[PDB]
Structure formats: C-alpha cells, structure tokens
C-alpha cells in the first residue's frame, strides 16, 4: 500500500479506525523539563495516548532522551510492552567523526539518540538479528532521528502494515500510515480504513 497519512492531533484522533499494525514507531515531543523551541506534550498526555488499540502482536519503536529514558520505559509498560532492545543513533559529522565539543548534555556531552524497542503479544513473521542496534548517520536537515530506521524495520517485518506517530511529511513511506500535526491534509488508500474513517467522521 503506497504512503498514507492523516494530519491530526495524536491526543484527539480516534485511532481505533486504523486497525492493527505490526510495528508502531513514535518520536514524541517529550516534556524534558527545559525550555525548548517547540511545544511538548505533558507526561500525562503521553501516558494516555491510545497506543494499546494499535497492536495485538508486534513491536514498538519509541525514541527517548533526557528524563524520557525513564518516562518512556514507564509508557512502554503502561501501553503493554516489554522492552527487549535499545537502538542508539550515533551522530556523525560530514567526515564520519563524532562531534565531541560544545556543551551538548548536562553532565557529559551527547553523541547519540536512544530508541526503545518493545514487544507486545506473540508476533510472527519477523526476522531476528538482521540488523545491529547501532545506527551511524549524519544529522540531515530537520531530522530528529535517522532515516535508516525505516530500512531496519522493513527488514525486521517485511510487507506488514506499520504506523508512525508524530511523523513529518518527509517520513511518509510505503506500508506506513503517518500521523502528525504537520502533514498535508488527509490521504488514505486502504479501503477498510477509508470506510471506518467516514463512519467515524461522517462530515470529513
């Protein structure tokens, strides 16, 4: 299924219309208890996201930083997952070197971003051990996480339907449905999803 997306607020969309997915991924605007140039969701707003409806069996990829190392683990547990891996994205400059200088963390400098990997239920049809848990990539444009994750997930769970929360227009991919408040309108191709959408949102 080609790319699909819904421009929406993740807190308020009825995601039960979307069916089940083999993989959920989210890169949320955590409240990391500091002034940021972007708006965040409260801890309680994150806890209450209706992640449980999206999957019965499958995987969750949850990007975390700062105090969300712990809050994200709590969310994984609240949403019904067990953490079974932790991917790190090692950020390199244009010459494949880590940028070691500046003040990029509170105590030590920061050379990586973390992504929790959770499992729910008893998935099948996945491929263990094809990729490593270390991604090495430059920071590209507005990217908050590296595009390499989509290929790792596809090799892990080929051909299955996947959903990304807090996604951006750059992130739309085949087999993915992308939700986020900066997407361009609503674009749904799956006939079973369009049917439930207009049943739930008759006026569009």
């Amino acid at each position: 299924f080609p790319p699909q997306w819904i421009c929406c607020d993740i807190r308020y969309l009825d995601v039960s219309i979307l069916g089940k997915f083999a993989v959920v991924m989210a890169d949320p605007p955590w409240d990391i208890h500091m002034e940021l140039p972007y708006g965040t969701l409260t801890d309680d707003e994150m806890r209450r996201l209706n992640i449980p409806v999206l999957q019965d069996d499958g995987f969750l990829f949850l990007w975390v930083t700062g105090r969300a190392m712990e809050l994200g683990r709590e969310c994984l547990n609240l949403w019904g997952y067990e953490r079974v891996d932790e991917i790190i994205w090692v950020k390199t400059n244009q010459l494949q070197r880590i940028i070691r200088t500046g003040r990029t963390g509170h105590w030590l400098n920061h050379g990586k971003e973390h992504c929790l990997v959770g499992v729910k239920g008893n998935p099948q049809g996945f491929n263990q051990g094809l990729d490593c848990d270390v991604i090495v990539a430059e920071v590209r444009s507005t990217s908050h996480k590296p595009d390499e994750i989509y290929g790792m997930i596809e090799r892990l769970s080929p051909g299955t339907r996947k959903i990304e929360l807090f996604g951006r227009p750059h992130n739309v991919q085949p087999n993915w449905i992308t939700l986020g408040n900066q997407l361009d309108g609503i674009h749904l191709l799956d006939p079973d999803v369009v049917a439930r959408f207009k049943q739930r949102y008759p006026d569009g």
């Binding site: 932790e86 200088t101 990729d131 848990d133």
Partner: protein
C-alpha cells in the same frame, strides 16, 4: 544511499566500523587546543593521584562499610552471567544476578554528593540497573555506551538472549548522581562536558571480559573528587588514584587509615585546578 545498516546486512561490517578517529590519541591529533585541555587535566589527575590500593574481598559476604572514607565516584563492574552466556565462556568466579547486585549497600559508602558508573550489559540490566540506582539513592543522569567494532573480523554475531530482535553490539554504563550538583557553579567538584557519552573500541578477544580503560578517563576528567572506588576490579585494572576491591585480586595492600590520610589535612579530597585548565575547560 550511504546506508551503513544496509552495508552491515551485505558485508558484516558493523556501522560503527566507519566512525573515524575514535582512539584516545587520534581524536584530537589535529586539534592542539582540545588535546591540550585533556593533557593538562590528565597531568592534574596524575599529580594528585594516590598510589594504587587494592583489597581482595568476597563482596557477597563482605561488610561494605569496612571501606572508608566516603567515595566521590564508584565504578561498579559486577560479573553478569550475560557476559558469559553471550560469549559462551564458563565463568571462573561467582556470577552476579541483578538481585545479588541490588543487595549491595552502596549508599552506605557513597559521599553525600557523588557519582556512580554501573556496567549494565545490553539486556535486562538496562532496566534493572536503573532500579539498583534508585535503591542506592542515585538518579540516572547519563548513559555511556561502549560501542564495539568488528573491523578485524567482519561478520554477524548471534545474540543469545531469546528476547533480542537486533544484533547487540554495545554495552551500557549507566551514570548516576547522588546529592545536589550544578555544573555552572560547582566547578571545584565537576568539569562537565569534557568527554562524550560514547566509547568506541574493537570487540575484545574471546575470553576477555575487560571493559575499556577509557571509562576511567571519563570519570577522572568529570569529577575532581579524589576518592575513587572500583568494585569488582581485578589485578589488571589496578590504577593510581583508585581503590580496587574484588574477589579475584591476588594480593591486598588496603589500609583504611593510610587511605583516608591521603585526603585529610593538609590534603584535600578534591584535586583542585590550575588557572590554565580553568581558562580552557568548557563553561556556561
């Protein structure tokens, strides 16, 4: 597409194999003033270091309160069964469960403001090590990842943990803080932002459980406290500036009165600092 993940799938070269200039020497070879900050800080550490002290002890059956005075930094390296499961090796010593580790009374020997560095492995320890930090009265505040390259033997490595979904190629050393410390105003206790939270080295030879020596450099650069304890160290990790305590040590020289005397008057438990380092170190 310069996708090193795809490249690993195709060739067995881990993505971290393509990070350049990760060694202690070559990282700042082209940056004389970055190199100078590290050189001067290492000189300050060496000038103020206690001679090595070490104690053989069965830590499971040891009153940890026998170690005095209080410690500014504690490096904790309990032998996890996963270190041996994932490599296939039979352990020569008692392996520690996370229940065993949690029972340690680390809060009884930590200074009121102090830091801990806990080697947690790659699996359940990332979660249970956090519980341990809570139990001992620390807040998790950084995560130093030891990323292992396989430049010398490219290929895949099967992770034995049946819950794993990816090939595990790193270990996590969780950093915890006890007490109140502010990087901008407590510069006589910490030099923040001198090191990054990554150590990159080649996979050790089979049978070698050692952790990368760079972890000591990160700790020593970061905290100016001179009272440094390495729990579950070995003969091979004994180091000036450190008290090493562990079951496999072959000899002991620790004397609690002598050790404490190195930090009491006319000495200080802090290294102090030079004006040259103060002018070079990162400050905000």
């Amino acid at each position: 597409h310069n996708d090193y993940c795809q490249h690993f799938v195709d060739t067995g070269h881990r993505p971290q194999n393509f990070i350049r200039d990760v060694g202690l020497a070559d990282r700042f070879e082209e940056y004389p003033k970055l190199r100078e900050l590290i050189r001067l800080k290492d000189e300050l550490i060496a000038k103020s270091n206690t001679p090595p002290m070490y104690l053989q002890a069965d830590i499971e059956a040891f009153d940890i309160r026998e170690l005095t005075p209080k410690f500014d930094v504690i490096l904790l390296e309990p032998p996890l069964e996963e270190y041996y499961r994932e490599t296939g090796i039979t352990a020569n010593e008692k392996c520690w469960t996370w229940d065993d580790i949690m029972k340690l009374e680390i809060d009884e020997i930590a200074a009121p403001r102090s830091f801990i560095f806990l080697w947690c492995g790659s699996g359940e320890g990332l979660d249970l090590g956090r519980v341990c930090l809570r139990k001992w009265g620390y807040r998790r505040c950084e995560d130093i990842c030891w990323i292992k390259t396989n430049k010398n033997n490219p290929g895949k490595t099967k992770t034995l943990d049946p819950k794993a979904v990816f090939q595990r190629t790193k270990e996590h050393c969780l950093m915890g803080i006890k007490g109140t410390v502010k990087p901008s105003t407590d510069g006589d206790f910490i030099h923040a932002n001198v090191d990054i939270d990554l150590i990159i080295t080649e996979e050790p030879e089979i049978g070698n459980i050692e952790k990368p020596v760079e972890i000591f450099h990160i700790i020593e650069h970061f905290c100016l406290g001179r009272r440094r304890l390495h729990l579950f160290g070995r003969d091979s990790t004994i180091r000036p500036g450190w008290l090493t305590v562990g079951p496999t040590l072959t000899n002991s020289n620790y004397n609690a009165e002598t050790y404490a005397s190195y930090f009491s008057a006319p000495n200080s438990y802090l290294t102090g600092c030079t004006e040259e380092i103060e002018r070079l170190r990162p400050k905000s």
